[PDB]
Design a protein around this ligand. Structure first.
Ligand SMILES: Nc1ncnc2c1ncn2[C@@H]1OC[C@H](OP(=O)(O)O)[C@H]1O
Ligand SMILES: [Mg+2]
Length: 756
DNA sequence: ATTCGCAGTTCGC
DNA sequence: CGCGAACTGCG
C-alpha cells in the first residue's frame, strides 16, 4: 500500500521515492528512470531546432533541453501534434518554461506545472492508499506557556500528550501525580522523550489538530532554541514546512501528517471549530476546556496542574478518536483521486476534481488545458443564471410531499453530453440543444467529462449492490466510504465547469446545465399543477414541496406516486424524479427558509436562523422551540406563551451568557475590510493586541449594554466576566429573538408589540 | 480558491 | 431620515 511520493537529488539527477507499507513493513522504493517533461506546440516543425538551442540557469549551472519527441495527442477531442520536451531535473522546467513560451515559434506550452512527484503517480498509474493494510496511527498535542503578546513560542512547551490504541499519556517537566503523566527534568528532555516514543511506535500517520499551523511550528522554534534534531521523519529528517497560500502545511517524510482541522472544516459545517466543538458534534459527548490563562497560572503557581494535565491528556485522546473516525473517509478519497492522503486531505473540492481529470486525461492521451493566465482569467469573471427558486406560498401547510430530481446536474451532463469537447462541434449528425442559452451539444460520441461522470455513477451503483450482499464489516465500511466519496465527486462537476480557475472550465457547459435544470423543474411544476390538481408551495432548483389543499394524507401520497410514473416516462434518459418523503406539516417563511416535520416526529430545518452560525443560541433555541410546538401539535398559543417567557427571562438577565454568543467568520485580512461591522471591530482590537487574525478565524463576540453602533459595545466572549460585564438584553430581544420569531408568527397576524 | 440565488443585519451618509 | 452599500452564510 502506497502512502506518499517525493524525490531527492543524487549528483544533480532526481530520484523518486515511493513510501509504502506491505504486510506491516515500511519500505522505500527508488526510481531513477523518471524524466520530467512538458509539451510544446509550434507553427513549424523546423522550429524544434531553434527551441532545442534554448538555455537558462538555475544553480550556477546552465539548464538545457535534454531530449525532444513529437507526439500526436488529443486536445479537447481534436487531434493535435505537440513536441515533448525532456529535461534532466524537475527544477529545470520552472527556470526555463517561460523562455520556450516567450519564443515566437512557440504558440503555447502545456503540462508544465505538474509537481514531479504528483506526476509520477499519474504516468505510472499508481494509486495511493490501496488495499487493506493496517496503518499504525498516533495522535499528539502540546501545552504551552502563553502570555499577553510576547511573540510566538517565546514561552516553553509545558507538556506533550500523545494517544493511540495503547492509551493517552502526557510528558511534562513538573511533578504531576497522575498515572498517565510521565515526569522528566526539563523541557528539552520532554521533547527528546517524545521523539523516543514516536521512533519506537513507528506510526504511519501522525494525527494533529492544527499541527500545520501551531504544534509543529512551536516544536520547531523550541527545538532551534534548545539545539534539538526534531527527526520525526522515517528517513531521519525534520518536518518540512510547505506554504499553501496564507496558511502552512507540514509533512513528516515516510509518514502521513494527518491534520484534522482542514478535513473537519470541509466535511462538517459548525459555528466554531474548536477541538471541544468538533468532539461533541461527532461523538455526542462534551469535552471540557482549559484556557491558556488557566494553564499559565497553574504552571507558574504550581497548583491545579492535575487539571491542566487532564486537559492535555484529553486533547491527545480525542484527536486519536477523531483521527480514527475520519482517516478511512480520506483514505478512500485518496484512493479515488490518486494522490496522497497528505495532499488530498488539504485540498479544496475544485482542486480535487482537477487531479482526477489530469489522471484520466493521461489515461486517454488527452492533452490538458493550462491554467488561465492573469489576463484570460479576467475574462472569466462573467456569470450566468443559476438555479430556479419559485415564489413561495408562505404560511403553514399540512400533508406535504417533497419531490426532487435524482442527481439533477450530473444526469443532465450525461444525458445531453454537456462537455467542452462536444460544445458546438460541427459535422455531428445528432445534437442536444439547451433551452434559453442555445448551446448545441454533439451526441455521436461520449464527451470527455460526461464519459468519466458516467463511469463514476455506474461504479457507485455497483458498489451499493456489492455492499448489501457482502457479510464482512471491513469490506462494507470501505465500500461505503468509496460509494459516499463518488457521490461528492460527481456533484462537483457543475461547480467545476463555472470555476474560473479550472483548466477544463466551460462557461457554456455550466449555464447549459442550469438552463436544463430550470426547464425541467419548472416544466414539472406545471405538469403536477395542471394534470393532477396539486398546489406547489415551494421549489428550490432541483425539487419542490407540493400538496392537494384539502385531501386525505393518503390521497396526496397515492397521487404523488401516480404522478411520478407519469413524468418519468416523459423525462429523457438519466433524468428521474423520486419521492423524497411525506411531511405532516411545514412552515415556509420566505425563499430559501423553511422547516418541515416528517410522520415519525422528526424536524428538519433549512436556511432558517437555526442553521446559521451568526445567530445566538437563545435566538436559535427559541425559534426551534416555537416550531417544535406548532409542527407536533399545531399549538399557536404555545408558540406565544413560549416567546413571552423568554423575553421576560432576557429582561431579568436570568438567561445564561453562553446562549448569547454571535459567531461571524473573518473572510479576508483586516487591513482590507471596507466596512467594519461588529465582528471585524472585535478582530481589529484583538489584532492590535498580540493575537493574529487570518482569513478563516471565527470570532465569538457578545453585546454589552450600551448605545449606538454595536461594534463599540462588543467584546470576545472569552473576555466576558459576569462580575465586570453586563449583557444587552435589549439587543438580544430587539435584534436576535423578536426578529427571528416574528417572521414566523407574522402569519397568525402577531405583531412585534404583541410579543415583548 | 465548486457554482449562483437570496434573506437579512449592521452602518454610514 | 430612509436608503443603499457592505457583508455573511446559507441551499
Ligand atoms: N455543490 C453544488 N454546487 C453548485 N450547484 C449544485 C451543488 N450541489 C448541487 N447542486 C445542484 O443544486 C440542485 C442539484 O441537486 P442534485 O443532487 O439533485 C444540484 O445539481
Ligand atoms: Mg428534506
Amino acid at each position: 500500500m502506497i502512502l506518499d511520493t517525493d524525490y531527492i537529488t543524487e549528483d544533480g539527477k532526481p530520484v523518486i521515492r515511493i513510501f509504502k507499507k506491505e504486510n506491516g513493513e515500511f519500505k522505500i522504493e527508488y526510481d531513477r528512470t523518471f524524466e520530467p517533461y512538458f509539451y510544446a506546440l509550434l507553427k513549424d516543425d523546423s522550429a524544434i531546432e531553434e527551441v532545442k538551442k534554448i538555455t537558462a540557469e538555475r544553480h550556477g549551472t546552465v539548464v538545457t533541453v535534454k531530449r525532444v519527441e513529437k507526439v500526436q495527442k488529443k486536445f479537447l477531442g481534436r487531434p493535435v501534434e505537440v513536441w515533448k520536451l525532456y529535461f534532466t531535473h524537475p527544477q529545470d522546467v520552472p527556470a526555463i518554461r517561460d523562455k520556450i513560451r516567450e519564443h515566437p515559434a512557440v504558440i503555447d506550452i502545456y503540462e508544465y506545472d505538474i509537481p514531479f512527484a504528483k506526476r509520477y503517480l499519474i504516468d505510472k498509474g499508481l494509486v495511493p492508499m490501496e488495499g487493506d493494510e493496517e496503518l499504525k496511527m498516533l495522535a499528539f498535542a502540546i501545552a504551552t506557556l502563553y502570555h499577553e503578546g510576547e511573540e510566538f513560542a517565546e514561552g516553553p512547551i509545558l507538556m506533550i500528550s500523545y494517544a493511540d490504541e495503547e492509551g493517552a499519556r502526557v510528558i511534562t517537566w513538573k511533578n504531576v501525580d497522575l498515572p498517565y503523566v510521565d515526569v522528566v527534568s526539563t523541557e528539552r528532555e520532554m521533547i527528546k522523550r517524545f521523539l523516543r516514543v514516536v521512533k519506537e511506535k513507528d506510526p504511519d500517520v501522525l494525527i494533529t489538530y492544527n499541527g500545520d499551523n501551531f504544534d509543529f511550528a512551536y516544536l520547531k522554534k523550541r527545538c532551534e532554541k534548545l539545539g534539538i534534531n526534531f527527526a520525526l521523519g522515517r528517513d531521519g529528517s525534520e518536518p518540512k514546512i510547505q506554504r499553501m497560500g496564507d496558511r502552512f502545511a507540514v509533512e513528516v517524510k515516510g509518514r502521513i501528517h494527518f491534520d484534522l482541522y482542514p478535513v473537519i472544516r470541509r466535511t462538517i459545517n459548525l459555528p466554531t471549530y474548536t477541538l471541544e466543538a468538533v468532539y461533541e458534534a461527532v461523538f455526542g459527548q462534551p469535552k471540557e476546556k482549559v484556557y491558556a490563562e488557566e494553564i499559565t497560572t497553574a504552571w507558574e503557581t504550581g497548583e491545579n496542574l492535575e487539571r491542566v494535565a487532564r486537559y492535555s491528556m484529553e486533547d491527545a485522546k480525542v484527536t486519536y478518536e477523531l483521527g480514527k473516525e475520519f482517516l478511512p473517509m480520506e483514505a478512500q478519497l485518496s484512493r479515488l483521486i490518486g494522490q496522497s492522503l497528505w495532499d488530498v486531505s488539504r485540498s479544496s473540492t475544485g482542486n480535487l476534481v482537477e487531479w482526477f481529470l489530469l489522471r484520466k486525461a493521461y489515461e486517454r492521451n488527452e492533452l490538458a488545458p493550462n491554467k488561465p493566465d492573469e489576463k484570460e482569467l479576467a475574462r472569466r469573471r462573467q456569470s450566468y443564471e443559476g438555479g430556479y427558486v419559485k415564489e413561495p406560498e408562505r404560511g403553514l401547510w399540512e400533508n406535504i410531499v417533497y419531490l426532487d430530481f435524482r442527481s439533477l446536474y450530473p444526469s443532465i451532463i450525461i444525458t445531453h453530453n454537456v462537455s467542452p469537447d462536444t460544445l458546438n462541434r460541427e459535422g455531428c449528425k445528432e445534437y442536444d440543444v439547451a433551452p434559453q442559452v442555445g448551446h448545441r451539444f454533439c451526441k455521436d460520441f461520449p464527451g470527455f467529462i460526461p464519459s468519466l461522470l458516467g463511469d463514476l455513477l455506474e461504479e457507485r451503483q455497483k458498489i451499493k449492490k456489492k455492499m448489501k450482499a457482502t457479510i464482512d464489516p471491513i469490506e462494507r465500511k470501505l465500500l461505503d466510504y468509496r460509494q459516499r466519496r463518488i457521490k461528492i465527486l460527481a456533484n462537483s462537476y457543475y461547480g467545476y465547469y463555472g470555476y474560473a480557475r479550472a483548466r477544463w472550465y466551460c462557461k457554456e457547459c455550466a449555464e447549459s446545465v442550469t438552463a436544463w435544470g430550470r426547464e425541467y423543474i419548472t416544466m414539472t411544476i406545471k405538469e403536477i399543477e395542471e394534470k393532477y390538481g396539486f398546489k406547489v408551495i415551494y421549489s428550490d432548483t432541483d425539487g419542490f414541496f407540493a400538496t392537494i389543499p384539502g385531501a386525505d394524507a393518503e390521497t396526496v401520497k397515492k397521487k404523488a406516486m401516480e404522478f411520478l410514473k407519469y413524468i418519468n416516462a416523459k423525462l429523457p434518459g438519466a433524468l428521474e424524479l423520486e419521492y423524497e418523503g411525506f411531511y405532516k406539516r411545514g412552515f415556509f417563511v420566505t425563499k430559501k427558509k423553511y422547516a418541515v416535520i416528517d410522520e415519525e416526529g422528526k424536524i428538519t430545518t433549512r436556511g432558517l436562523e437555526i442553521v446559521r452560525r451568526d445567530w445566538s443560541e437563545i435566538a436559535k433555541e427559541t425559534q426551534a422551540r416555537v416550531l417544535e410546538a406548532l409542527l407536533k401539535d399545531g399549538d399557536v398559543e404555545k408558540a406565544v406563551r413560549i416567546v413571552k417567557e423568554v423575553t421576560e427571562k432576557l429582561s431579568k438577565y436570568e438567561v445564561p451568557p453562553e446562549k448569547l454568543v454571535i459567531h461571524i467568520q473573518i473572510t479576508r485580512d483586516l487591513k482590507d475590510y471596507k466596512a467594519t461591522g461588529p465582528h471585524v471591530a472585535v478582530a481589529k482590537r484583538l489584532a492590535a493586541r498580540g493575537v493574529k487574525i487570518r482569513p478563516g478565524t471565527v470570532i465569538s463576540y457578545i453585546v454589552l449594554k450600551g448605545s449606538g453602533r454595536i461594534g463599540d459595545r462588543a467584546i470576545p466572549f472569552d473576555e466576558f466576566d459576569p462580575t465586570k460585564h453586563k449583557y444587552d438584553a435589549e439587543y438580544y430581544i430587539e435584534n436576535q429573538v423578536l426578529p427571528a420569531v416574528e417572521r414566523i408568527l407574522r402569519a397568525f397576524g402577531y405583531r412585534k408589540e404583541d410579543l415583548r
